[PDB]
Write an enzyme that holds these catalytic residues in place. Structure first.
Site, PDB file in Angstrom:
ATOM      1  N   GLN A   1       0.864  -1.221   0.000  1.00 18.53           N
ATOM      2  CA  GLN A   1       0.000   0.000   0.000  1.00 18.53           C
ATOM      3  C   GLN A   1       0.883   1.248   0.000  1.00 18.53           C
ATOM      4  O   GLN A   1       1.933   1.272   0.645  1.00 18.53           O
ATOM      5  CB  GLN A   1      -0.945  -0.002   1.216  1.00 18.53           C
ATOM      6  CG  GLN A   1      -2.368   0.478   0.938  1.00 18.53           C
ATOM      7  CD  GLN A   1      -2.612   1.924   1.340  1.00 18.53           C
ATOM      8  OE1 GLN A   1      -3.024   2.200   2.467  1.00 18.53           O
ATOM      9  NE2 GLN A   1      -2.366   2.853   0.419  1.00 18.53           N
TER      10      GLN A   1
ATOM     11  N   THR B   1      -3.773   5.095  -4.917  1.00 16.95           N
ATOM     12  CA  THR B   1      -2.862   3.957  -4.596  1.00 16.95           C
ATOM     13  C   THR B   1      -2.624   3.094  -5.830  1.00 16.95           C
ATOM     14  O   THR B   1      -3.569   2.607  -6.452  1.00 16.95           O
ATOM     15  CB  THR B   1      -3.423   3.079  -3.455  1.00 16.95           C
ATOM     16  OG1 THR B   1      -3.492   3.851  -2.248  1.00 16.95           O
ATOM     17  CG2 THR B   1      -2.540   1.847  -3.214  1.00 16.95           C
ATOM     18  N   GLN B   2      -1.351   2.912  -6.170  1.00 17.75           N
ATOM     19  CA  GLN B   2      -0.950   2.099  -7.304  1.00 17.75           C
ATOM     20  C   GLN B   2      -0.092   0.932  -6.833  1.00 17.75           C
ATOM     21  O   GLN B   2       0.234   0.816  -5.650  1.00 17.75           O
ATOM     22  CB  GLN B   2      -0.108   2.925  -8.280  1.00 17.75           C
ATOM     23  CG  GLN B   2      -0.779   4.154  -8.869  1.00 17.75           C
ATOM     24  CD  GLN B   2      -0.068   4.662 -10.118  1.00 17.75           C
ATOM     25  OE1 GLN B   2       0.900   4.061 -10.598  1.00 17.75           O
ATOM     26  NE2 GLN B   2      -0.551   5.776 -10.655  1.00 17.75           N
TER      27      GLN B   2
ATOM     28  N   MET C   1      -3.107  10.994  -2.949  1.00 20.13           N
ATOM     29  CA  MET C   1      -2.985   9.540  -2.770  1.00 20.13           C
ATOM     30  C   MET C   1      -3.051   8.773  -4.093  1.00 20.13           C
ATOM     31  O   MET C   1      -3.667   7.712  -4.181  1.00 20.13           O
ATOM     32  CB  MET C   1      -4.055   9.031  -1.794  1.00 20.13           C
ATOM     33  CG  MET C   1      -3.916   9.585  -0.384  1.00 20.13           C
ATOM     34  SD  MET C   1      -2.369   9.100   0.407  1.00 20.13           S
ATOM     35  CE  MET C   1      -2.687   7.372   0.757  1.00 20.13           C
TER      36      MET C   1
END
Ligand SMILES: *[C@@](C)(CO)[C@](*)(O)[C@H](Cc1ccccc1)NC(=O)[C@H](Cc1ccc(OC)cc1)NC(=O)[C@H](C)NC(=O)CN1CCOCC1
Ligand SMILES: [Mg+2]
Lengths: 212, 235, 244, 222, 240, 231, 195, 232
Positions: D1, H1-2, H107
């Protein structure tokens, strides 16, 4: 933090410690946990430092706007409820505040309101708030009478914070004293625990648990 | 009809120029700046004798160090004052200091042009804004609905303004006391007012660095009226 | 831009009147007369249809009288299409109150809200007002039997007897003359029909040019019944009062 | 994450004299066990005799400094070129930090300068905006190593007057710029020995009524 | 949204839509407020060209905003409901946040601000209504009477009247009301209110409403006979 | 006449009268002058008062350390446009670490003013501006008119009786253009230029306003006792 | 919070609500009134999540008071209870629901009858002769099943209530610092001072 | 988020007396699979700046499009686009740094580590790093990924502080870079033999070398190693 404020014959006593913590790290020993909202209104701070600081200074701005608009000083009830309604809007977001709004008005008399970040709002004669509240309660409750002299009440408040400063690892630094009457609040000085503990131990004959 | 934000062929906004006419119908308001303070005075002008004159609020506190007097459509001022008070208190919250009198006036004058097709018309009220700050000292500002403001040593607005301004031209000097200025406002008000000036149909106020902005009681003003007449009989 | 084509429906005249409301009332004055009469034991609603054609389907028709709920009905004077917009709004509003409180809506509350909607069209939005006047006939357990009227201004008032639409000046005079407070429903019926018979612009009053309704306590014990008269039933009540 | 935060190390130090104030900071920038730069300055002159450092997560630190510098610029435009007092700067920074209360700048911030009576001032902030004026404050990685040394050497804590039976405390007194700079250098050489993220170089900004001066010193590079 | 600036300035500096709203007030039925030494009375004309009215259910001219404040008006009836509703909501909102009922001046200031906002907002016309707002502040026995109008200006009044023929009754009140000695009792105050309405009304039958407000949320509306007694007494004293 | 009701209407000859009426507000405004050499750019502005008891309306506004303007017309419209410029200069610094070219400043002002001349409900800006600045290609002077048209110049003037000063500059061109590395002399040429637009009144201490920007000179404004030198 | 009871007798409705307010290991207050008068003949007690309880009670109170002023009429206990249920039924599918359980005790002046409504935070309503929220019910319901009669006087209702409070003080783990008792009948709402 | 899919490994760079050098291999890895072998990860902007990019390749290609678009936009209404008002390395960098930090703040990062190498108009060398977190720093030697661990130590033996830069020639500097690329090929399991190298000199301008290879590799000693302890 340990903070308290109690009502008695001669008005309101307000006493707070001055420690700031970042876990077990002592962040500061010289922190102001009382805000003077106006000459007749006080606010105490316990919990997250900026949460308390930011929103009680904001509270002061709201009280100032009330007297500009209404040509009249805000009631303690109304000032406490502005703060409680604000924190209630943020309920769940993770604010941490344990505050007491103390003051005098003609229509109310001396009044203390406990306001916390769960949205609880309570009028009462005695409250102690913070990590060291229980330690303060122990001393205060066992020496409290309505008929205390201003001199004795001032000392009892001072001695109750000292008790908590000693036992509670997350309280200490110094005691800040206030007295609130019909004529407004009166500051009764800063009292460093470094000197106060030994002065109290000697004069009172108490704290026999310690190596004197 | 025609657009709210239309220019006349002479290069002026019709609606702003028409609001200026509405201000000339307003009750007289006078402000005088001295080195000891700034005085603000107004004609109350009750429409009927049954109306309780102390309910006529035409002089108004903005902060402890800034005060305001109005003339024209006085109902339009309520939101202008509300803005000023918020601007003043908000600045203190952000910067832990008193806000400059000029900056306050500029904040209010920004509202003025936020009209068109924002609000639907310009304000029909002019304001005298008086205050003190550490940098530029005692100040008096005239704030029109054109979004323009001028600083003034002395200034009159309302119906009796052109005559009152001519009187202020002669009488003002850089060494005026506060007491002299109080009397001077009362003198010029009595001149331009229709009905006879008394403590009920006229109101005084000042702002000093020491005691901040104060509206004078009717008892305090009465003595200044008596003091004024006595001094004019004496030559 | 578009400013050129704006009639400005929500402005004052120099006299302080609302042009569009005044003109909507002028429109209503040419509509089939509707009458409401309130008695001690019920309410009557009677209304004259706009110049009928013989080929119109009279029995499956609804031009004048509408059921808002079980306890409340209205008589229309003006644009039917405008009225139907407001009626469905009123019907929904009544069901909301019942859903919220588990009690049928007080007559006035329903009347106030419809009248409040009308008011809005006179003060903001730049649309034309509804060209409709209502007579509300209803019962609740607070005030009992009630008659109200509302018009395009959004103003509503209560009545013992009232008319709207055409010839209300003539009709109100006749009602004021023969009405009395102790009056019964069956007498109120007779009054309503006799009043329409004299104010009508037609040659004679017939069953096929009328709509008729009553709200009595005429069911079984302590409860209300709405009766929207059928064509044959109007024909009978018209014979019984000696108008035909 | 995805973790939007990081720790760029370093440490900072503010001391206030009578008519001056210093804001010091090491010039090392790190991530994990790597050195990114041996000279990456993190103490800045922000105008109006205010020096600022925001130690911790560099990207958030640079973002904050950049915003405050911008705040000073607009204060001048909006308030007739008025000087931003150190107390007003502090309050302004509180609002910057608290504006992101629920997604904080991961920085311990210190500013230094002169108060409105010409006396030296140091203000310090937590990551979300609570502030306090002090004579003395260290911030960042080695704060825990340096701060108690400063309590002892600047505010004379736990130091009593000899032969007074531990009854009379060592009296407080202001320190000279020469003495303060000795404490700064000794504080940083000590911190460098015992903390791995501290080293390479020391940069001090001194603030008097005459302006802002700089001083640089080599530190151990291991 | 419908955006048009309807309330705008004319070359002479007048806002005609505000002034025409005042004409609507002038057409409305008369309303008068008189405050005594320990009471306030609100009197209201009811035009008598309407028989067959149902007076039980027809909206009363005086409306309670809270248990201690009342509001009467002259002008457009429909417009008044919108101001009343808002005022009632603000009254409960004030109780909720301040833990204290509104002062009469505060409640007046709110209604006045609403009226003013409708004079410089796009797409709307001003309220064709002037109000009289009366009552007693919480824990206070000094009576309060205020007036608002379409422009948004408000002010306090020893006694005041609005609506049609209000200039006649204001003339009456101006000589018949002594500031030095206001109506001592309730009876005296109601009498003066009715007298002033009888200058204008027609017949003191179902043409006059009276509402008497006393301190500590003590508000009552008088009935036909109680009013009719004042009428009969005033006429008998007249013939002299 | 029938075509001056709004900005969105063309006259039959192809004119926009609301834009022309906005231009008329500039003619009523007090005179202001701009001029540059290769090293410095200067603004000189005659300030106007309401009466003898009033202050003198400020005409010059700073936009960045290297750029600012003078105004003639509606002052609040200059405040809006100057604020927009302050933001654009600032966006260039924060994002690109780059001082905004004076030419781009001109292009951005043009495009902002133009949008108000083609939309219903809006109005043209009622102000003229003279932007000076020093960037990567030296000193610059721009003239902004609220029609949208922006022009780079060696010198110019706008306001009431601006034709006088504008002719002087047109004569003086070859002299002042070469006042390099001398601030005080370039200002003097500006003060002499503005003097060709005076009637009855002459330049006093609280009447005159001068600004300068150049190679090693931040944009600074001079008023009051600090302009006494040049009268 | 925690303890709120209600008993409907012949001519009245009796509500009993604990006085303690606790947070952590500290009883912050021992004289708390967990009730709001919604109208002269209607009373609502409340218990649940801190902050929510009062905020909800006062929000409901304002709404009912607004209705009373608008209509110059008191809403029936049934109507108030239905309004309150609908608000809680909305709340449970909101972003953050009100976690408050209530008892509504009222005297219906049209029927001349007392009424007791039990409503939980989900919006689940029931009219009962006796009711309780929280762990209280686990002791009181069975006690009242045995001792309660429908034709009891207000005085007999109070004795029946003392019997509940006695059992709770005996068997409940927490000190709830006694109760405040209020009676709702044809003459309105009044508080018993000595309990 | 990647999560990054197709990735590029180390980018290494250093300053020398007149300019800067930057290099990066031509591999596009897909986990442990060495999927693509013709990937250029050095992207020049004008003739005074090279941007070297590591990390997610799809995000690299996106950044390519931004820079290409930036050049176009800068030319608009700009007579001095190829002169005084040309794009500087500092302008290009700050723009990227701005973008990177905004993306991390929403994000949704661009999963990259970037080094902007170039020469300013005044002759000064520019070398600065930025990554997915928006973290920025400058040094005489900069490297990403394994480069930071293995290249920097070698490059710092040449330029250990600011004062060593005038003493370092382009011959010495390029040799250190090419040696560093060899070491990375020995020890980085996601590196390739083929790489590109770019010099930005204040006198000779931009030299862009493609299709370079790691040569002079020591492998001969391998034939002597048997077993893992006791084998003979
Ligand atoms: C005593 C000392 C127990 O902490 C008091 O509650 C004290 C009150 C106080 C009031 C005004 C000024 C200073 C201190 N509280 C603290 O010192 C407080 C303890 C605390 C930390 C975090 C909390 O999170 C909900 C709650 C209480 N300490 C701080 O606020 C310190 C200075 N700052 C931080 O820990 C920074 N945190 C704040 C929360 O967000 C993440 C960063
Ligand atoms: Mg090392």
């Amino acid at each position: 933090t340990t903070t308290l404020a109690f009502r008695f014959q001669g008005g309101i006593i307000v006493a707070v410690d001055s420690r700031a913590t970042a876990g077990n790290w002592v962040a500061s020993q010289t922190v102001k946990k009382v805000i003077e909202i106006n000459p007749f209104l006080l606010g105490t701070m316990a919990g997250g430092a900026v949460d308390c600081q930011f929103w009680e200074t904001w509270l002061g701005s709201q009280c100032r706007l009330h007297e500009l608009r209404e040509k009249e000083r805000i009631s303690v009830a109304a000032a406490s409820k502005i703060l409680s309604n604000l924190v209630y809007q943020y309920k769940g977001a993770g604010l941490s505040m344990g505050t007491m709004i103390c003051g005098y008005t003609r229509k109310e008399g001396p009044t203390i309101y406990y306001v916390d970040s769960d949205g609880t709002r309570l009028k009462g004669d005695i409250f102690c708030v913070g990590s060291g509240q229980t330690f303060a309660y122990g001393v205060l409750d066992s020496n409290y009478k309505w008929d205390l002299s201003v001199e004795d009440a001032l000392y009892l408040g001072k001695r109750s914070i000292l008790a908590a400063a000693h036992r509670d690892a997350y309280s200490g630094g110094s005691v800040n004293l206030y007295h609130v009457t019909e004529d407004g609040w009166i500051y009764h000085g800063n009292h460093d625990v470094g000197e106060l503990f030994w002065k109290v131990k000697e004069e009172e004959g108490s704290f026999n648990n310690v190596i004197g | 009809d025609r657009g709210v934000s239309t220019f006349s062929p002479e290069g002026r906004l019709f609606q702003v120029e028409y609001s200026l006419e509405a201000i000339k119908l307003g009750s007289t308001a006078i402000g005088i700046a001295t080195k000891e303070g700034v005085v603000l005075g107004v004609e109350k002008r009750a429409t009927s004798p049954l109306l309780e004159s102390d309910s006529i609020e035409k002089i108004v506190e903005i902060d402890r160090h800034i005060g305001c007097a109005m003339s024209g459509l006085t109902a339009d001022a309520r939101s202008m004052i509300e803005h000023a008070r918020t601007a003043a208190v908000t600045h203190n919250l952000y910067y832990d200091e008193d806000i400059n009198v000029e900056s306050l006036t500029q904040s209010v004058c920004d509202l003025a042009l936020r009209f068109g097709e924002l609000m639907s018309r310009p304000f029909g009220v002019a304001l005298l804004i008086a205050g003190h700050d550490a940098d530029d000292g005692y100040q008096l500002f005239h704030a029109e609905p054109s979004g323009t403001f001028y600083r003034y040593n002395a200034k009159a607005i309302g119906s009796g303004s052109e005559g009152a301004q001519a009187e202020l031209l002669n009488e003002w000097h850089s060494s005026l006391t506060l007491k002299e200025a109080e009397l001077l406002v009362l003198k010029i008000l009595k001149q331009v007012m229709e009905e006879k000036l008394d403590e009920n149909n006229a109101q005084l106020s000042c702002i000093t660095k020491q005691d901040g902005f104060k509206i004078y009681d009717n008892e305090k003003t009465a003595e200044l009226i008596k003091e004024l007449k006595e001094k004019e009989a004496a030559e | 831009g578009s400013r050129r084509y704006d009639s400005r429906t929500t402005i004052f005249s120099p006299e302080g009147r609302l042009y569009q409301v005044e003109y909507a009332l002028e429109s209503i004055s040419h509509a089939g007369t509707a009458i409401g009469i309130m008695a001690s034991d019920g309410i009557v609603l009677a209304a004259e249809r706009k110049v009928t054609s013989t080929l119109l389907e009279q029995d499956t028709s609804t031009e004048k009288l509408y059921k808002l709920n079980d306890k409340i009905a209205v008589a229309v004077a003006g644009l039917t299409a405008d009225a139907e917009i407001l009626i469905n709004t009123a019907r929904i509003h009544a069901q909301n109150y019942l859903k919220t409180y588990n009690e049928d809506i007080p007559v006035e509350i329903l009347v106030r809200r419809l009248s409040d909607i009308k008011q809005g069209y006179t003060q903001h939005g730049g649309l034309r007002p509804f060209g409709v006047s209502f007579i509300y006939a209803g019962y609740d357990d607070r005030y009992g039997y009630q008659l109200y009227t509302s018009n395009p201004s959004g103003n509503y008032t209560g009545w013992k007897a009232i008319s709207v639409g055409a010839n209300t000046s003539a009709a109100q005079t006749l009602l004021q003359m023969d009405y009395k407070d102790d009056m019964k429903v069956d007498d109120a019926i007779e009054l309503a029909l006799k009043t329409l018979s004299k104010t009508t612009d037609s040659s004679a009053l017939t069953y096929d040019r009328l709509e008729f309704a009553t709200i009595r306590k005429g069911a079984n014990d302590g409860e209300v019944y709405q009766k929207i008269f059928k064509p044959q039933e109007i024909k009978d009540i018209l014979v019984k009062t000696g108008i035909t | 994450q995805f973790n939007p935060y990081g720790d760029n190390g370093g440490t900072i130090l503010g001391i206030a004299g009578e008519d001056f104030a210093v804001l010091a900071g090491d010039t090392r920038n790190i991530t994990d066990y790597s050195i990114n730069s041996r000279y990456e300055p993190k103490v800045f002159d922000c105008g109006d005799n205010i020096v600022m450092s925001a130690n911790g997560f560099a990207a958030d630190g640079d973002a904050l400094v950049k915003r405050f510098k911008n705040s000073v610029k607009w204060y001048h435009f909006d308030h007739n070129d008025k000087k931003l007092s150190i107390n007003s700067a502090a309050r302004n920074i509180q609002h910057l930090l608290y504006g992101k209360r629920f997604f904080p700048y991961y920085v311990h911030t210190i500013i230094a300068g002169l108060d409105e009576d010409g006396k030296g001032a140091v203000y310090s902030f937590d990551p979300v905006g609570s502030y306090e004026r002090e004579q003395c404050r260290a911030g960042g990685a080695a704060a825990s190593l340096i701060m108690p040394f400063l309590d002892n050497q600047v505010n004379f804590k736990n130091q009593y007057e000899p032969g007074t039976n531990g009854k009379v405390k060592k009296p407080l007194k202001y320190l000279s710029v020469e003495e303060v700079i000795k404490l700064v250098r000794d504080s940083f050489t000590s911190a460098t020995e015992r903390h791995i993220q501290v080293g390479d170089g020391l940069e001090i900004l001194i603030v008097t009524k005459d302006g802002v001066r700089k001083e640089f010193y080599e530190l151990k590079r291991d | 949204g419908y955006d048009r600036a309807l309330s705008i300035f004319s070359p002479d500096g007048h806002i005609f839509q505000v002034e025409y709203a005042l004409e609507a007030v002038k057409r409305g039925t008369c309303a008068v407020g008189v405050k005594g030494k320990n009471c306030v009375v609100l009197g209201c004309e009811r035009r008598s060209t309407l028989k067959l009215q149902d007076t039980r259910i027809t909206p009363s001219k005086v409306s309670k905003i809270d248990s201690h404040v009342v509001l009467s008006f002259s002008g457009l009836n429909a417009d008044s409901r919108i101001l009343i509703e808002k005022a009632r909501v603000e009254a409960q909102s004030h109780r909720l946040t301040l833990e204290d009922p509104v002062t009469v001046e505060y409640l007046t200031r709110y209604v006045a601000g609403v009226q003013q906002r409708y004079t410089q907002s796009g797409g709307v016309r001003p309220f064709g209504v002037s109000t009289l707002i009366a009552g007693f502040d919480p824990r206070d026995d000094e009576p309060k009477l205020y007036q608002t109008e379409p422009s948004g200006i408000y002010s306090s009044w020893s006694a005041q009247t609005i609506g049609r023929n209000s200039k006649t009754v204001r003339e009456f009140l101006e000589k018949n009301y002594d500031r030095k000695e206001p109506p001592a009792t309730v009876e005296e105050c109601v009498k003066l209110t009715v007298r002033s309405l009888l200058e204008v009304v027609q017949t003191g039958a179902k043409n006059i409403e009276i509402t008497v407000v006393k301190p500590d949320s003590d508000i009552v509306a008088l009935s036909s006979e109680e009013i009719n007694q004042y009428v009969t007494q005033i006429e008998q004293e007249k013939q002299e | 006449n029938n075509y001056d009701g709004d900005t969105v209407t063309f006259s039959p000859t192809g004119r926009l009268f609301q834009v022309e009426y906005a231009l008329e507000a500039i003619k009523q405004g007090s005179v202001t002058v701009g001029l540059r050499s290769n090293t410095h750019a200067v603004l000189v502005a005659l300030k106007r008062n309401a009466d003898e008891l009033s202050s003198y309306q400020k005409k010059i506004i700073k936009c960045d350390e290297h750029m600012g303007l003078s105004l003639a017309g509606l002052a609040p419209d200059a405040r809006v446009l100057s604020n927009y410029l302050r933001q654009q200069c600032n966006y260039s610094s924060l994002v690109f670490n780059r001082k905004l070219a004076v030419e781009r400043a001109g292009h951005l002002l043009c495009d902002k003013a133009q949008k108000n001349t083609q939309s219903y409900g809006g109005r043209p800006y009622g102000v003229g501006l003279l932007i000076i600045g020093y960037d990567k290609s030296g000193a610059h002077l721009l003239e902004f008119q609220p029609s949208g048209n922006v022009t780079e110049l060696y010198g110019t003037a706008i306001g009431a009786r601006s034709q006088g000063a504008k002719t002087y500059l047109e004569r003086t061109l070859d002299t002042f253009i070469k006042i390099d590395g001398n601030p005080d002399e370039l200002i003097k040429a500006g003060v002499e230029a503005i003097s060709q637009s005076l009637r009855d009144e002459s330049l006093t201490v609280d009447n005159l306003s001068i600004a300068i920007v150049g190679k090693d000179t931040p944009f600074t404004i001079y008023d009051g006792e600090a302009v006494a030198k040049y009268i | 919070m925690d303890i709120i009871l209600g008993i409907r007798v012949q001519d009245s409705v009796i509500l009993a609500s604990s006085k303690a307010v606790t947070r952590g290991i500290s009883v912050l207050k021992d004289s708390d009134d967990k009730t709001r008068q919604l109208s002269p003949h209607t009373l609502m007690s409340f218990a649940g999540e801190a902050g929510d309880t009062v905020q909800f009670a006062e929000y409901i109170q304002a709404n009912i008071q607004l209705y009373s002023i608008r209509e110059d009429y008191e809403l029936s206990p049934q109507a108030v209870s239905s309004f309150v249920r609908q608000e809680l039924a909305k709340s449970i599918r909101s972003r953050r629901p009100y976690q408050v359980n209530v008892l509504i005790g009222g005297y219906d002046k049209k029927k001349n009858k007392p009424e007791l409504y039990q409503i939980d935070y989900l919006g689940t309503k029931v009219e009962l002769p006796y009711g309780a929220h929280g762990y209280s019910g686990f002791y009181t319901f069975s006690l009242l099943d045995h001792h309660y009669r429908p034709d009891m006087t207000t005085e007999e209702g109070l004795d029946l209530l003392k019997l509940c409070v006695q059992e709770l003080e005996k068997r409940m783990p927490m000190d709830f610092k006694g109760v405040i008792v209020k009676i709702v009948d044809k003459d309105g709402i009044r508080q018993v001072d000595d309990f | 988020t990647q999560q990054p899919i197709v990735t590029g490994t180390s980018v290494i760079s250093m300053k020398y007396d007149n300019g800067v050098i930057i290099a990066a291999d031509n591999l596009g890895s897909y986990g442990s699979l060495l999927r693509f072998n013709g990937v250029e990860r050095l992207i020049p902007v004008g003739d005074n700046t090279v941007v070297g990019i590591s990390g997610d390749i799809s995000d690299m290609q996106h950044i390519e499009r931004l820079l290409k678009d930036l050049v176009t936009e800068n030319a608009y209404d700009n007579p001095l686009a190829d002169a005084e008002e040309a794009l500087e390395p500092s302008y290009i960098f700050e723009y990227l740094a701005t973008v990177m930090y905004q993306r991390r703040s929403k994000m949704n990062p661009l999963w990259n580590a970037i080094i902007v190498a170039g020469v300013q108009s005044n002759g000064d060398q520019f070398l600065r790093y930025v990554n997915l977190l928006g973290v920025t720093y400058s040094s005489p030697t900069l490297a990403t990924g394994f480069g930071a661990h293995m290249a920097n130590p070698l490059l710092r033996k040449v330029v250990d502080r600011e004062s060593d830069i005038p003493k370092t020639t382009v011959q010495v500097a390029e040799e250190a870079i090419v040696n560093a690329m060899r070491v990375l090929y020995y020890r980085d399991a996601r590196s390739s033999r083929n790489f590109s190298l770019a010099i930005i000199d204040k006198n000779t301008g931009l030299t862009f070398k493609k299709n370079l290879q790691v040569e002079n590799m020591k492998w001969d000693f391998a034939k002597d190693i048997k077993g893992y302890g006791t084998q003979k």
